[PDB]
Amino acid sequence: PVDQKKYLEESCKPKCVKALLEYQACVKRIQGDETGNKHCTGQYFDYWSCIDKCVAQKLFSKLK
Amino acid sequence: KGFVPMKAVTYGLSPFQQKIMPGLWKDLPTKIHHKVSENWISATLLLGPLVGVYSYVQNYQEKEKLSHRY
Amino acid sequence: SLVRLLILKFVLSMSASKDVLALASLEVDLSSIEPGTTVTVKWRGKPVF
Amino acid sequence: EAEHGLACPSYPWPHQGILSSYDHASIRRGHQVYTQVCASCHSMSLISYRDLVGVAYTEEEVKAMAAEIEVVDGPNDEGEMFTRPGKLSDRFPQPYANEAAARFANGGAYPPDLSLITKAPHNGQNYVFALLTGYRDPPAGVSIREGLHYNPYFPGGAIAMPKMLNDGAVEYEDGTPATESQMGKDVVSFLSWAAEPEMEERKLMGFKWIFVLTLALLQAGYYRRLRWSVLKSRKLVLDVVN
Amino acid sequence: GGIFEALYKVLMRRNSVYVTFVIAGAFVGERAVDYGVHKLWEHNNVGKRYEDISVLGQRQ
Amino acid sequence: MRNQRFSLLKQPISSTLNQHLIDYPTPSNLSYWWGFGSLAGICLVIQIVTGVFLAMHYTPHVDLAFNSVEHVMRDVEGGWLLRYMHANGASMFLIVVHLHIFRGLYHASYSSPREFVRCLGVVIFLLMIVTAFTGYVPPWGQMSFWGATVITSLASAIPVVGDTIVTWLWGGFSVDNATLNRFFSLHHLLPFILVGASLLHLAALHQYGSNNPLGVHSEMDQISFYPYFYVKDLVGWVAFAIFFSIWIFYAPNVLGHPDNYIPANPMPTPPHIVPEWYFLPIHAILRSIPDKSGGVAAIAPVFICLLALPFFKSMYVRSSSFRPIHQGIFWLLLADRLLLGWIGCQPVEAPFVTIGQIPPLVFFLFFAITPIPGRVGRGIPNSYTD
Numbered sequence: 001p002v003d004q005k006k007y008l009e010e011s012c013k014p015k016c017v018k019a020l021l022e023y024q025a026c027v028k029r030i031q032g033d034e035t036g037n038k039h040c041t042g043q044y045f046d047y048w049s050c051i052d053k054c055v056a057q058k059l060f061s062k063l064k
Numbered sequence: 065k066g067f068v069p070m071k072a073v074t075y076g077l078s079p080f081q082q083k084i085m086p087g088l089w090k091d092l093p094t095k096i097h098h099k100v101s102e103n104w105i106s107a108t109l110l111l112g113p114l115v116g117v118y119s120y121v122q123n124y125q126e127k128e129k130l131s132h133r134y
Numbered sequence: 135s136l137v138r139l140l141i142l143k144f145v146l147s148m149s150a151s152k153d154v155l156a157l158a159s160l161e162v163d164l165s166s167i168e169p170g171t172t173v174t175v176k177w178r179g180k181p182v183f
Numbered sequence: 184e185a186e187h188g189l190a191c192p193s194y195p196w197p198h199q200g201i202l203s204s205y206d207h208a209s210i211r212r213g214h215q216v217y218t219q220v221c222a223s224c225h226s227m228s229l230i231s232y233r234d235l236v237g238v239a240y241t242e243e244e245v246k247a248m249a250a251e252i253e254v255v256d257g258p259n260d261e262g263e264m265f266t267r268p269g270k271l272s273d274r275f276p277q278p279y280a281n282e283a284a285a286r287f288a289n290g291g292a293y294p295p296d297l298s299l300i301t302k303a304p305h306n307g308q309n310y311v312f313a314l315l316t317g318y319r320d321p322p323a324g325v326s327i328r329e330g331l332h333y334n335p336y337f338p339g340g341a342i343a344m345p346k347m348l349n350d351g352a353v354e355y356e357d358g359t360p361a362t363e364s365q366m367g368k369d370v371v372s373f374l375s376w377a378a379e380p381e382m383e384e385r386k387l388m389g390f391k392w393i394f395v396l397t398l399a400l401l402q403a404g405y406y407r408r409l410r411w412s413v414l415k416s417r418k419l420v421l422d423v424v425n
Numbered sequence: 426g427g428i429f430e431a432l433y434k435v436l437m438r439r440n441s442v443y444v445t446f447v448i449a450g451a452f453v454g455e456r457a458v459d460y461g462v463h464k465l466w467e468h469n470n471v472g473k474r475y476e477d478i479s480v481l482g483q484r485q
Numbered sequence: 486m487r488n489q490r491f492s493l494l495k496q497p498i499s500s501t502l503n504q505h506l507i508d509y510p511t512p513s514n515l516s517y518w519w520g521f522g523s524l525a526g527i528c529l530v531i532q533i534v535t536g537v538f539l540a541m542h543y544t545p546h547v548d549l550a551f552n553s554v555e556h557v558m559r560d561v562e563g564g565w566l567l568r569y570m571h572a573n574g575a576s577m578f579l580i581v582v583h584l585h586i587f588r589g590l591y592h593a594s595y596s597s598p599r600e601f602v603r604c605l606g607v608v609i610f611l612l613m614i615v616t617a618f619t620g621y622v623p624p625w626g627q628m629s630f631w632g633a634t635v636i637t638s639l640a641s642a643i644p645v646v647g648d649t650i651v652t653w654l655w656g657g658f659s660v661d662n663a664t665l666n667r668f669f670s671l672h673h674l675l676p677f678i679l680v681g682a683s684l685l686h687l688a689a690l691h692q693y694g695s696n697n698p699l700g701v702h703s704e705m706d707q708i709s710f711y712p713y714f715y716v717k718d719l720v721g722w723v724a725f726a727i728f729f730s731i732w733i734f735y736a737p738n739v740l741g742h743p744d745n746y747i748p749a750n751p752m753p754t755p756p757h758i759v760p761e762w763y764f765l766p767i768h769a770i771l772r773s774i775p776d777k778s779g780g781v782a783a784i785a786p787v788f789i790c791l792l793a794l795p796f797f798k799s800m801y802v803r804s805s806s807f808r809p810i811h812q813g814i815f816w817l818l819l820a821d822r823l824l825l826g827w828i829g830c831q832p833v834e835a836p837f838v839t840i841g842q843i844p845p846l847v848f849f850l851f852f853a854i855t856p857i858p859g860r861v862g863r864g865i866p867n868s869y870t871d
């Protein structure tokens with residue numbers, strides 16, 4: 001079988017294209033990390049909060 | 065704990081000779097307006113500091129979090 | 135109705151509980167004994183003559 | 184902002200609502216998923232076998248299923264610890280012998296008890312569901328020590344348990360596609376029933392008595408007004424101006 | 426109305442009759458509200474009950 | 486004398502109940518803020534009955550306490566109802582008494598001749614706090630263990646006697662089974678002392694009668710207690726029952742911390758340790774000081790000021806209706822007290838240190854300011870006269 005949940009998570013890109021492009025800018029900015037202790041965790045959390053909020057009301061209808 | 069000589073006169077009516085419920089909802093809007101106009105200052109003084117402190121804390125926390133990023 | 139509800143609930147709280155009632159039906163093995171003598175066996179909470 | 188862990192959203196569960204009940208087929212499938220995937224390291228130890236009759240199985244199924252397993256019993260006349268198959272008044276078996284063995288078999292990490300796992304953390308239902316379905320690729324700039332996995336729904340960012348829910352990890356008896364999400368939903372329904380077995384009786388009593396007591400409040404208010412009518416319309420003359 | 430006066434004269438010239446009336450009304454209203462709430466509960470969520478699982482007897 | 490009997494309600498057998506419940510004279514303009522004493526009495530009775538029936542299924546040992554609570558909830562007919570009533574009735578009881586206290590503060594009920602009533606009320610409040618804190622332990626969860634540790638080890642900040650009294654209190658070297666069994670016995674005992682103090686409180690009030698929303702002499706217009714205030718109490722009780730049962734039946738865990746469903750484990754510490762919701766003002770005042778001795782000895786001014794309000798002797802008008810400035814100060818104090826409550830449940834860093842150190846200053850400026858209105862307003866008739 002194929003997971004419905006991942007299908008919806010990959011569907012919801014237009015909702016937070018803005019957070020997606022922000023995270024892309026973060027990773028392009030950090031590109032070239034020397035000492036470590038630099039990361040893009042905040043944009044990660046923003047992005048996945050967007051995606052989860054998109055999927056929340058839609059997911060349980062598809063299930064049984 | 066004692067009493068006082070009074071000299072008053074009173075008239076009364078029986079309970080079972082008068083309409084009871086219709087008094088609650090008679091003229092509500094004027095009563096509401098009177099209460100609001102009388103206690104607006106108490107409401108303001110009760111609810112001011114909470115709003116001010118909450119807004120200040122929210123602003124400070126979001127500023128700090130967004131300044132710690134990379 | 136309120137008084138009856140509360141009285142009955144408080145009274146029923148003190149009756150035998152589901153855990154105790156589950157342990158009320160089973161049998162164990164018994165064996166032979168000497169002529170005219172007795173040796174008891176074990177059950178739920180009660181012996182056997 | 185990484186030490187707290189991501190926030191689990193709110194989902195429309197079929198047992199939410201003021202007049203809603205458990206979906207017992209979901210309980211059945213969740214118990215199957217637990218007993219075939221999860222009982223390898225976790226344990227319940229609070230739920231007995233007899234709890235399931237009338238809730239997800241008939242009595243005979245539970246009797247045979249309990250007769251599958253072996254548990255120990257106290258001394259015979261000899262003085263030995265023997266074993267005999269299970270009964271209706273036994274509890275869900277444990278996979279280890281103590282917590283020390285549990286930590287030994289997982290790398291020093293103890294897998295907790297799942298009896299109350301929904302009530303014990305903040306926002307139980309959604310936390311457990313999003314935790315199960317949340318293993319993901321770590322963000323740029325962070326690394327995880329070997330022997331650990333990444334999950335944003337864990338406070339710390341790095342967890343010890345490995346992913347289990349995978350497409351086809353179990354095979355139902357009703358013909359439902361065993362997707363990760365379906366399995367997770369059934370598991371969470373089972374765990375919610377296990378934590379709060381009294382929900383439906385609670386809600387029935389609540390509805391009945393709220394309604395009845397509202398009626399009594401109406402009557403008491405009328406009683407009050409009727410008694411005070413005599414004083415509250417009294418007239419008096421007093422002989423004073425200022 | 427006049428029905429209220431008729432009920433008043435029928436039931437409240439004594440007191441033990443009043444006590445019996447109160448008890449009877451209680452132990453009738455209890456049953457009526459029980460029936461009503463049970464029926465609404467059954468109506469709200471159909472198909473989820475214990476006697477509605479399609480595989481209840483296929484683990485023999 | 487009355488050489489033949491008239492009524493059963495005036496015979497010697499029922500003289501006390503009649504005189505103090507049925508025929509007692511009360512002002513006729515008492516409002517709904519005068520029902521919370523009776524309502525709190527009913528709350529105390531509910532607590533006592535529910536506890537006497539919970540203590541038939543609970544075993545005070547470290548191995549068994551958690552499992553015995555869960556046995557009650559899962560295996561006894563209706564036991565979940567008993568536990569939910571107890572664990573939520575504590576919260577209802579605290580709510581009602583807080584409203585009672587603030588009523589007393591508004592219409593200035595502590596002044597003469599009613600300061601014995603205020604002092605007995607403060608003593609009752611102390612007993613209530615001790616009883617609730619001792620009884621939050623016996624379930625033996627995570628918060629039970631760590632709250633007991635923090636609060637009862639806060640008593641080693643005192644000079645030389647400190648460690649000795651802490652070790653004598655704990656019955657040993659750490660919070661363990663001895664402390665559990667000790668606290669269980671104290672919890673079963675204290676509420677009867679609470680009952681006795683409540684009865685003494687009521688006698689002390691009945692020897693002068695109650696106040697009224699006007700604060701004037703009230704001996705010319707009084708009505709009996711029954712049936713005029715019995716029916717008003719009835720309305721209050723039914724509304725309270727509706728509220729209580731909304732808590733019990735449809736949201737019985739909103740007013741607690743989730744961490745008490747994890748059995749006590751002395752090695753790992755929770756990341757955020759707090760006590761119940763009705764100790765957070767004291768808790769915030771207590772952590773507001775960067776010093777152990779100062780932090781512990783800052784609670785003492787709270788109780789000293791609460792116990793020394795009645796003895797200022799210049800103010801002449803009681804009710805806050807005719808006192809605009811004291812009324813505004815009352816509302817501002819209420820806001821500040823809520824702010825302390827909210828702060829008491831936060832982590833200790835910026836920006837909460839300043840907001841945890843200033844509200845104590847305001848909470849003490851309240852008890853400092855009020856005599857100044859007393860003096861400055863004692864001479865008010867001479868200026869505004871017509």
Ligand SMILES: CCCCCCCCCCCCCCCCCC(=O)OC[C@H](COP(=O)(O)OCCN)OC(=O)CCCCCCCCCCCCCCCCC
Pocket residue numbers: 600601604605608788789792793796
């Ligand atoms: C946490 C540690 C606490 C340790 C103790 C701390 C105490 C701090 C208290 C500080 C407040 C000051 C107290 C001063 C008391 C006496 C002051 C006073 O004014 O008394 C005098 C007054 C009558 O005298 P008067 O008529 O005014 O003078 C005549 C002049 N020609 O007298 C009166 O008016 C009579 C009033 C009597 C009411 C007060 C009785 C004492 C309070 C009762 C509470 C105690 C109950 C405890 C019950 C359990 C006991 C363990």
Ligand code: HEC
Pocket residue numbers: 217220221222223224225289292293294295300311314315337341342343344345347348370
């Ligand atoms: C490989 C053995 C194993 C399997 C099988 C297993 N777990 Fe875990 N589980 C663990 C370990 C180890 C931990 C402790 C994680 C830690 O402390 O980092 C854990 C922890 C958890 C937690 C606690 C998370 C938290 O936030 O504290 C939950 C919830 C959980 N598991 C759910 C499940 C569910 C649901 C299943 C069935 C799909 C399952 N587990 C199956 C090993 C397992």
Ligand code: HEM
Pocket residue numbers: 518519520521522523525526529582585586589594595602603606607609610683686687690694695696697
């Ligand atoms: C178990 C706790 C308590 C009980 C049972 C209780 C009960 C009562 C009752 C029944 C009354 C008279 C009826 C009424 O006026 O409503 C009263 C009056 C009063 N109580 Fe309490 N109370 C308690 C706690 C407190 C506390 C903690 C305080 C103060 C800190 C307090 C202060 C007062 C005051 C000032 C009055 C005066 C009433 C008036 O001004 O007319 N009480 N109490």
Ligand code: HEM
Pocket residue numbers: 529532533535536537539540543554568571572575578613616617620621622623624672673676
């Ligand atoms: C004779 C009187 C009382 C007895 C016998 C009693 C008994 C008990 C028992 C056995 C427990 C443990 C059971 C459990 O925690 O679920 C408990 C808990 C508790 N008690 Fe009492 N109690 C009494 C009065 C009171 C009073 C008057 C208060 C508060 C004013 C109170 C507050 C509490 C609290 C807050 C708990 C915590 C329960 C929880 O949070 O889970 N008790 N009591």
